[PDB]
Curated annotation (Swiss-Prot), chain A:
This is Small ribosomal subunit protein uS4. It comes from Oryctolagus cuniculus. SMART domains: Ribosomal_S4, S4. Pfam families: Ribosomal_S4, S4. Signal peptide: none annotated.
Swiss-Prot record, chain C:
There is a cross-link at residue 36 (Glycyl lysine isopeptide (Lys-Gly) (interchain with G-Cter in SUMO2)). PANTHER family: 30S RIBOSOMAL PROTEIN S12 FAMILY MEMBER. GO terms for biological process: translation. This is Small ribosomal subunit protein uS12. One of its GO terms (cellular component) is cytosolic ribosome. The modification 3-hydroxyproline is found at residue 61. The gene is RPS23. The lineage of its organism: Eukaryota, Metazoa, Chordata, Craniata, Vertebrata. GO terms for molecular function: structural constituent of ribosome. Keywords: Acetylation, Cytoplasm, Endoplasmic reticulum, Hydroxylation, Isopeptide bond, Nucleus, Ribonucleoprotein, Ribosomal protein, Ubl conjugation.
From Swiss-Prot, chain D:
It comes from Oryctolagus cuniculus. It comes from the Eukaryota. Signal peptide: none annotated. The modification N6-succinyllysine is found at residue 48. Component of the 40S subunit of the ribosome. Contributes to the assembly and function of 40S ribosomal subunits. The lineage of its organism: Eukaryota, Metazoa, Chordata, Craniata, Vertebrata. It is found in: Cytoplasm; Nucleus. Component of the 40S subunit of the ribosome. This is Small ribosomal subunit protein eS30.
Amino acid sequence: PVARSWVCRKTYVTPRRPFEKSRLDQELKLIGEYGLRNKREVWRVKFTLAKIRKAARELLTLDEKDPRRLFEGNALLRRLVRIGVLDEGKMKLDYILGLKIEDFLERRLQTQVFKLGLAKSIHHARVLIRQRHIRVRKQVVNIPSFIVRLDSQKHIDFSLRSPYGGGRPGRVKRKNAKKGQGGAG
Amino acid sequence: TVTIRTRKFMTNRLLQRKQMVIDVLHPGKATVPKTEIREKLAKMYKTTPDVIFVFGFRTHFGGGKTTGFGMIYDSLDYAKKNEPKHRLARHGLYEKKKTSRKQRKERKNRMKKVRGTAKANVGA
Amino acid sequence: GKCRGLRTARKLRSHRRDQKWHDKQYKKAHLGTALKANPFGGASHAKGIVLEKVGVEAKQPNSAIRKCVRVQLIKNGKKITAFVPNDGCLNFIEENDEVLVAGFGRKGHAVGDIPGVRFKVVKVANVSLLALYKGKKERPR
Amino acid sequence: GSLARVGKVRGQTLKVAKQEKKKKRTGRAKRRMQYNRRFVNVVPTFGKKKGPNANS
RNA sequence: ACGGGGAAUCAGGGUUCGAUUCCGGAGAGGGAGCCUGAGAAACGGCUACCACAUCCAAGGAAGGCAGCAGGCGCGCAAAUUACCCACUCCCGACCCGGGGAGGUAGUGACGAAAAAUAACAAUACAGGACUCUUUCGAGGCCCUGUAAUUGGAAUGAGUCCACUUUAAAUCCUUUAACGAGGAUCCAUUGGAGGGCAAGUCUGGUGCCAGCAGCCGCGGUAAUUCCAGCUCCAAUAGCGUAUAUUAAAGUUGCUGCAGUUAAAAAGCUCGUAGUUGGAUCUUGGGAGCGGCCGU
């Protein structure tokens, strides 16, 4: 008897067939297109899709004018439009089945940093976030897997404690200044 | 460059405490100490700098917000009446003991051996 | 199934319950005869004592000497031939040494050439046979 | 019979010392090196494909 | 074999596990018998006997970690003789006392999460959409690539004033100045014949040594061994062993098979068991929207 949580689940499932030739091709093609660190980072986003997807199978196979399905289903629809993945007119629950992996990965803040021109490449964008350059609504986001919300897209720029934003120089810009007048006079 | 914005203000007439959640907005400096906190609470609600007991700060990630809990009382005779014994120990008006429970418990069990008034002589 | 009657639950359940014994892997794990005669007694690893080093003759067309070790376990005293794997790893093992003996792979079956050698050596007196082979650690004496 | 020729090969094969090599980039950096090799550089090869480790 | 809540796996059905924090039960070395009390067949109570074991002036006497730490033993298999009533609370005659219940630390790759080990230019130069030229070639409007060529930018690890945190420390957060160019501040563990992603590369060994889950490889050209470069896979992880699930429509209720592959009793009767023919309630009025629907 001890007052702790323990409640933890796995965010990815590994593929059953480990070395399908064409499957390893696609999962590597997703990395360079979105700058991911490992195949783990691909597998979890396919599984977040699969969770969302499998809820639709549980909802489409229910009755119509159903007291569960209309509440249960129209909140999943309300989730997927706010995150910026699903459309505002096509938030009827048929269109979630025609909804692929590449839809989620553009809402990854690793790419939002890249696709507003406040990075140079998608690999550089990870260096900006993981070395805490950026904020979203005046809160420093250190992690590239920030699922940027639809209204939360217009606030993404650099943090207030960043030389790449509106702040003081870092370490390297001061060391050429340390060598500058230190030897001059 | 410090800004206190007090949140969820309540008055307990049954503990004598005006209590608030203190939103300190300090950019580019560390979590500011309780000495620098309470000296702003003195002329935030026209309060005396004795009865203000502030604790439990949590700095938000980035370096622009801590939101800890503090309470301002009616008098210091009420401040001893209704306080944790450690939140009187930060300010220096409750000087605690310095002997721990390993000493006390083995002192207690040696007392448990003697019947009569000879309990006075066993420990130390 | 054969008998499909709506009130035939006890027959359809009980017939399976009987015919499930005719399954090989069921009867290995529901009679305790295999669990009795399992030399480890349902362990993944077992420590024993190297009493003799015996070079086993490889079986069909593969003609080679499989350098194994006869081990006697602590918990049982039941005697086990354990194949020492890598290129020149029998010369890490001596008489009356403690060795952590694991299963071979095929769950109490002879694996590849080696006849009747259902176990292998993993550690050589608290130093792993990989660490000795790669030379990351040494054997104490 | 004879447990006498134990570790005959590994024993007397002339040890080549492992070579000073450029340290391989680890994490997302390898996948950048791995991606830009595979599907941004290369061209349609007439005949059947060469493996990435196809030395000939 | 404590039981269930549950757990793992899982198209659908299932199969397997539940010692383990929540509930109920049992038990305090094994049984048995009791006192006190509202309540106990109490064991941080007692009285025996049995097993075991302690102190001893030999007369006696005291004991019960399946509480918390620790220690031995057994093993494949498991953490500190640490801190504290500050929290949750419980007891007391109680605002005050007490509590290894509980909380905070040490240990910890059982595991789950997030996520460093580079990034950006600079010219060599290797190509590519393309104005030009049949090509060999230049432009370069789009950059695309790699590298012990040259740079100006980064943050974290680490070191540590200072708060913060909390009972008191801790850890995170926050904060200074110090902190990266073979950013040696150096990512491994396994593989490379097939299944199965990935070298008919060299050097050695020559049915030997070894590899190899299975098929198999090794007999002097070894893609399989042992090494060098190499590359493939997963990545702060990864290999092995064992139980178990799916794979298994190889337990088949969904859903198998029985002529010849494993398999219909030699044949018939027969009580349980299972399954059993058709058969008894139809059509009309009426309210109603765009002949039909309610």
